[PDB]
Design an enzyme around this catalytic site. Structure first.
Site, short mmCIF file in Angstrom:
data_model
loop_
_atom_site.label_atom_id
_atom_site.label_comp_id
_atom_site.label_asym_id
_atom_site.label_seq_id
_atom_site.Cartn_x
_atom_site.Cartn_y
_atom_site.Cartn_z
N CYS B 39 0.80 -1.22 0.00
CA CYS B 39 0.00 0.00 0.00
C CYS B 39 0.82 1.25 0.00
O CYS B 39 1.72 1.40 0.81
CB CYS B 39 -0.95 0.05 1.19
N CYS B 42 0.47 3.66 3.23
CA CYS B 42 1.17 3.17 4.39
C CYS B 42 2.57 3.73 4.54
O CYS B 42 3.02 3.94 5.64
CB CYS B 42 1.16 1.66 4.39
#
Ligand SMILES: [Zn+2]
Lengths: 59, 116, 70, 973
Positions: B39, B42
């Site tokens: 991700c 993140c």
RNA sequence: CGAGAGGUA
DNA sequence: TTACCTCTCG
């Protein structure tokens, strides 16, 4: 007309302090001595003394 | 880490370890982060969680879990999307709080200081 | 990739896991994009009177998304 | 693991090399040490290499520089001597010596001096085939064997099969005889070699025969062979194989080698050099040990292992290497960029390397193998052009000496991609493309075409057939070329000039960041060593101008700061804090800023308003006209510190009781600094005495003559004669400073700071400046800084124009200044004259670029002389401004004076002014009195010396004059 | 004073 | 090739 690559990528604020621990920078550099001591290649003063004294006692 | 201090101060835990900590006793607040290397959002949370750690040194435990490694646990803990944090209290009568999304650092501080 | 070094995670963006070749997202994002591409959009939802909530409405209002139904 | 996903640290190569020497290098050299016994049999010495310990430095690094010591480490190793008579064992650990240590930045402090070791490029050991075109008929072919020893082995085949070794100066030597020397049967040879008939028709070890591991591998690749790697010898089979290949070429089946390719070259480094030196030193310890053994016999005394060995051989070897080797050089510390660039340098010259005058033209051109490894632009101009160069950003050093450039695999695979580093040889066999995938027709993307490299050539191929792609923005260039904005629009010749000028910039008293940059300024600051970065996480508990305290998990760490200190190049270093008290920091984050750095970025210059137009001739050629604002607001002021040192009426006002000038004194030329043997100020030094250091010393036979050092600071402002430059190859010297009222002015009322000639751009081909000036104006108005990576036109055609024009328009609209963007002539405006108020006729280019001030200043340059000290033998004036000397009238100048026909003027230069002692002393008098100077008759000293020198080789030269009137011959002395 | 090294134009 | 400048090192 408007540019295909966005200009936001280019802009930085005029009063900014760079963060070196950010996604585009290399890992923090280590002092050679400390690194060498951590991995055992260079030993401390106390250690020579301890080894030297024991050797003297053995002799 | 006697001579060289470690750069990263948040540690990866596992489902079993998380469970012990929860069932056992604690005296400081627990924050758990669910993340994946894939991700993009993140990458930004990680930088923020590392700062909260420097600030609250032994007054909180911040721990991390990877979804690829422990997918089923995540489903059981009801995680609907990737940037998710669970704030759990040292008192066991109080409810836990789940936050979804990138949220600012001040909000994190307010939850720890006031609500938990 | 590595658990801790996030300077390496970009590589996964270069070669993506398949399910996330074009990741989609929250309904708010579609509205901001529609306005930018020309167009008029409105967002229907509830947010709290807390600080984060106010920030979000401000962002949308600034981007010119109709926020009357919030 | 590094450099994939990020730009590698700029000092990584030095760090790795040092580590290899510390462990692997030390052990390997130690092993070879011989057990030593003497005569028929004598006492045996054992150096046990199993147990070697390196111990920590006794002095800290800062102290070493303060007391002129060397930062080093102590090697203690265990040994036992069995005296031949005794038959018993004594064991101790002897202090062999001191080995120097490196700071992470890659420097060594030796005798107080920061020192750096440069890398060298040399030809790798192996077999190379060359076809020499032959003067008569068919061409001769040859083979050669480069070795670590450097001996080369030659084998050749003529039109008639020759297979004759060319090692002997003699034309014919037999390769077959060498094969027979190996004990090979004639029959054995035949079975081994293909092309038997041709050879049928035809019916050292210490140096050449050793091939290093690198040498062996190359041999195995060129002539396919598979002797195992541990083997490292010129085994005979190889020689046979070489002959076999040699004849195949004569029949058409072969490849002639290119020796300029980098697969055939190797790189030596810090590690190699250090290991080598350790070996020399070690051989010297054997000589010393044998000698003390003999001494023991004379005194008939029981040896203590320590007594046999001294520490002198290790220390002396290194002290000499650092001091006298060609590739160990002192670090340039003019600015932070200079410190980072020096390490990355590569040289063809060096010991056991080429010499500049000798080297061929072909060695000094770019080769297609260099891409990604050595920067195309950087070189040192001169007779050394093409032989000194620089490593590119993403390069690394491989297991073997070769360099490696990163490449991305686009070929389908599970992961589908990986970044790999490729040896100079391996990548010639893959197709590499640097284009992009933004083209689609009625067919699919895979069928679209792109330019690509393959086998040292450029071709166009479809996207399906490409294997590797080059993805990084700064890959093909060095640090200096990567700091120029809009490089795509500047001709390459200029880029060499530009990289060179940034290195010559002076750190200024107050620093400011650029509006337009490339984005590598941030990493350049991190790796320079001029910033203070955190070593541990924590919170800031106390800040004072001298120190910072960081408090992390129960510990308090003190970080010292640098206040007003000198550098090797007479420039000032000063650190200023960036962190407010009470703030949390993570490891690696900035705490203080150094000189020429603001907010974590390199800042070597200032941003000023400029116009490009002609002005009354003040800008002729390359000269600049500037406003006084720069002088009175202090934009370009710099501090310079010099040191003067010695070994132990109005004047003497300053001196103290001991006679040393006090701190805080203002001194002027002539004044004594330290009390016949007095040290006095030279011309042009006038400054405050910032410090005095009476340094006691050790090392000399006497307690080393205590050194008294005085340090003096000069503050220097911009003046007529200074050199200023921009980042695109534009340089000029200031010609006039004018008051603000007379300067050209804009429709806003403001007056331009500098005025540059506009006739320069067409000749020098830099259109980059025009793009940078215009973007600067926009950023100032809109409050934005821009960091743009190179080669932006990859995205679209005319990308840069779209960025600059768009930004100028926004500024024009937001702050309502319509002149910033003018639709009829974009980028140009109409300005007025300060003197008369009238508009200049045609529109002009106005912008704020970034301008730097160079180290070459007028004050250093000016010199003058009348009379003065004269040399001992030649009795001519002394050379050098420091030495108060004269100037040379040389060969070329004489010729010019002769063309004019000015004999009297010339004679004067050769006699009264230089070297005629009697005559010289008279002219000073005639002039004070007011008289006439006679023409000299005697000879100058120069001539007298020649006669004396010749009379030393037993030859006589005499000068005689024969009188016309009476015919007498007279001998002049 | 003899060598070496880095520059400048 | 000329000239110019700084340094270190025995
Ligand atoms: Zn461009």
């Amino acid at each position: 007309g408007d540019p295909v690559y966005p200009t936001i990528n280019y802009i930085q604020d005029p009063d900014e302090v760079i963060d070196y621990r950010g996604p585009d920078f290399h890992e923090p550099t280590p002092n050679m001595l400390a690194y060498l001591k951590e991995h055992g290649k260079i030993i401390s003063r106390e250690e020579l003394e301890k080894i030297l004294a024991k050797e003297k006692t053995e002799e | 880490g006697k001579y060289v201090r470690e750069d990263y101060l948040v540690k990866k835990v596992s489902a079993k370890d998380i469970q012990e900590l929860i069932k056992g006793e604690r005296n400081v607040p627990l924050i758990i982060d669910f993340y994946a290397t894939w991700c993009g959002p993140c990458i930004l949370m990680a930088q923020e969680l590392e700062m909260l750690a420097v600030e609250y040194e032994s007054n909180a435990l911040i721990v991390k879990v990877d979804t690829d490694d422990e997918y089923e646990f995540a489903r059981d803990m009801q995680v609907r999307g990737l940037p998710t944090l669970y704030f759990i209290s040292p008192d066991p009568n109080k409810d836990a709080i789940r936050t979804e999304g990138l949220i600012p650092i001040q909000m994190m501080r307010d939850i720890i200081n006031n609500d938990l | 990739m590595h658990q801790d070094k996030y300077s390496e995670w970009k590589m996964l963006q270069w070669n993506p896991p398949e399910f996330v070749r074009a990741p989609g997202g929250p309904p708010s994002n579609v509205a901001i994009s529609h306005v930018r591409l020309g167009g008029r959009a409105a967002f229907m939802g509830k947010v709290g009177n807390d600080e984060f909530g106010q920030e979000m409405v401000l962002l949308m209002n600034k981007e010119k998304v109709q926020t009357r139904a919030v | 693991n590094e450099g994939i996903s990020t730009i590698p640290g700029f000092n990584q190569i030095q760090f790795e090399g040092f580590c290899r020497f510390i462990d692997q290098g030390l052990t390997e050299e130690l092993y070879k040490f011989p057990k030593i016994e003497d005569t028929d049999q004598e006492i045996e010495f054992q150096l046990f290499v199993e147990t070697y310990q390196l111990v920590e430095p006794l002095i800290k690094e800062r102290d070493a520089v303060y007391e002129s010591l060397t930062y080093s480490s102590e090697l203690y190793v265990s040994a036992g001597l069995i005296w031949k008579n005794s038959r018993d064992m004594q064991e101790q650990t002897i202090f062999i010596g001191n080995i120097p240590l490196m700071n992470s930045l890659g420097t060594s402090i030796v005798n107080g001096i920061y020192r750096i070791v440069i890398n060298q490029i040399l030809q790798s050991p192996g077999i190379y085939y060359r076809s020499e075109l032959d003067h008569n008929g068919i061409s001769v072919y040859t083979g050669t064997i480069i070795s670590d020893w450097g001996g080369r082995s030659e084998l050749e085949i003529d039109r008639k099969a020759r297979i004759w070794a060319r090692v002997s100066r003699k034309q014919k030597i037999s390769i077959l005889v060498l094969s027979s020397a190996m004990g090979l049967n004639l029959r054995e040879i035949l079975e081994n070699v293909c092309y038997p008939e041709i050879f049928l028709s035809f019916l050292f070890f210490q140096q050449r025969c050793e091939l290093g591991r690198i040498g062996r591998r190359n041999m195995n690749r060129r002539l396919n062979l598979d002797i195992p790697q541990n083997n490292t010898f010129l085994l005979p089979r190889d020689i046979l194989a070489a002959a076999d290949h040699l004849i195949g070429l004569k029949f058409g089946m072969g490849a002639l080698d290119d020796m300029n390719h980098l697969k055939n070259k190797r790189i030596r480094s810090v590690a190699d050099l250090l290991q080598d030196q350790f070996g020399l030193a070690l051989v010297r310890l054997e000589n010393v040990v044998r000698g003390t053994i003999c001494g023991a016999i004379r005194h008939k005394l029981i040896p203590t292992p320590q007594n046999l060995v001294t520490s002198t051989p290790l220390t002396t070897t290194y002290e000499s290497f650092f001091g006298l080797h060609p590739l160990s050089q002192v670090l340039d510390r003019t600015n932070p960029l200079t410190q980072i660039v020096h390490g990355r340098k590569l040289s063809y010259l060096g010991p056991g390397g080429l010499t500049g005058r000798t080297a061929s033209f072909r060695i000094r051109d770019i080769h297609p193998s260099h891409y990604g490894r050595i920067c195309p632009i950087d070189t040192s101009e001169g007779i050394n052009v093409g032989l000194i160069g620089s490593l590119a950003i993403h390069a690394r050093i491989g297991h073997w000496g070769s360099l490696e450039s990163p490449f991305y695999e686009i070929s389908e695979r599970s992961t589908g991609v990986r970044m790999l580093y490729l040896s100079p040889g391996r990548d010639e066999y893959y197709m590499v493309a640097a284009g992009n995938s933004l083209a689609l027709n009625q067919d699919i993307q895979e069928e679209q075409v792109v330019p690509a490299r393959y086998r040292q050539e450029f071709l166009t191929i479809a996207w399906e057939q490409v294997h590797l792609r080059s993805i990084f923005p700064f890959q093909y260039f060095s640090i200096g070329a990567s700091l120029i904005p809009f490089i795509e629009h500047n001709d390459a010749n200029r880029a060499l000039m530009s990289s060179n000028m940034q290195r010559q910039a002076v750190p200024l008293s107050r620093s400011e960041k650029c509006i337009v940059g490339t984005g590598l300024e941030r990493q350049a600051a991190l790796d320079s060593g001029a910033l203070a970065i955190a070593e541990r996480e924590g919170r800031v508990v106390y800040t004072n101008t001298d120190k910072i305290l960081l408090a992390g998990n129960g510990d308090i760490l003190s970080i010292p700061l640098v206040i007003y200190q000198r550098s090797n190049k007479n420039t000032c270093m000063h650190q200023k804090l960036q962190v407010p008290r009470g703030k949390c920091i993570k490891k690696g984050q900035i705490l203080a800023d150094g000189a020429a750095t603001v907010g974590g970025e390199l800042a070597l210059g200032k941003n000023v308003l400029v116009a490009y137009m002609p002005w009354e001739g003040y800008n002729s050629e390359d000269a600049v006209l500037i406003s006084e604002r720069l002088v009175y607001e202090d934009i370009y002021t710099s501090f310079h510190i010099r040191k003067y040192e010695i070994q132990t009426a109005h004047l003497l006002r300053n001196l103290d009781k001991n006679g040393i000038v006090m701190l805080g004194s203002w001194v002027e030329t002539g004044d004594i600094l330290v009390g016949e043997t007095c040290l006095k100020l030279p011309i042009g030094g006038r400054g405050r005495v910032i410090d005095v250091r009476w340094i006691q010393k050790r090392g000399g036979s006497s307690y080393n003559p205590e050194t008294i050092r005085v340090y003096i600071l000069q503050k220097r402002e911009i003046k007529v004669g200074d050199k200023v430059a921009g980042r695109h190859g534009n340089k000029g010297i200031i010609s006039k400073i004018l008051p603000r009222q007379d300067m050209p002015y804009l429709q806003d009322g403001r007056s331009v700071d500098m005025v540059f000639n506009p006739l320069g751009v067409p000749s020098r081909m830099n259109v980059g400046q025009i793009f940078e000036c215009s973007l600067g104006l926009a950023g100032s108005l809109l409050d934005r800084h821009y960091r743009i990576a190179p080669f932006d036109e990859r995205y679209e055609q005319e990308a840069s124009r779209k960025l600059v024009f768009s930004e100028l328009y926004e500024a024009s609209k937001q702050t309502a200044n319509p002149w910033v963007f003018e639709p009829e002539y974009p980028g140009k405006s109409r300005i007025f004259d300060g003197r008369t108020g009238n508009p200049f006729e045609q529109p002009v280019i106005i912008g704020k670029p970034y301008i730097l001030k160079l180290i070459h200043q007028v004050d250093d340059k000016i010199h003058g002389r009348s009379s003065g000290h004269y040399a001992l033998v030649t009795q001519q004036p002394l050379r050098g401004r420091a030495k108060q000397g004269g100037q040379r009238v040389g060969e070329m100048e004489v010729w010019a004076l002769e063309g004019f026909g000015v004999a009297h003027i010339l004679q004067e230069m050769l006699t009264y002014k230089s070297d005629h002692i009697r005559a010289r002393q008279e002219v000073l008098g005639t002039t004070i009195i007011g008289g006439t100077i006679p023409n000299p008759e005697d000879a100058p000293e120069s001539f007298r010396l020649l006669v004396r020198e010749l009379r030393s080789l037993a030859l006589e030269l005499n000068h005689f004059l024969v009188s016309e009137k009476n015919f007498q011959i007279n001998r002049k002395e």
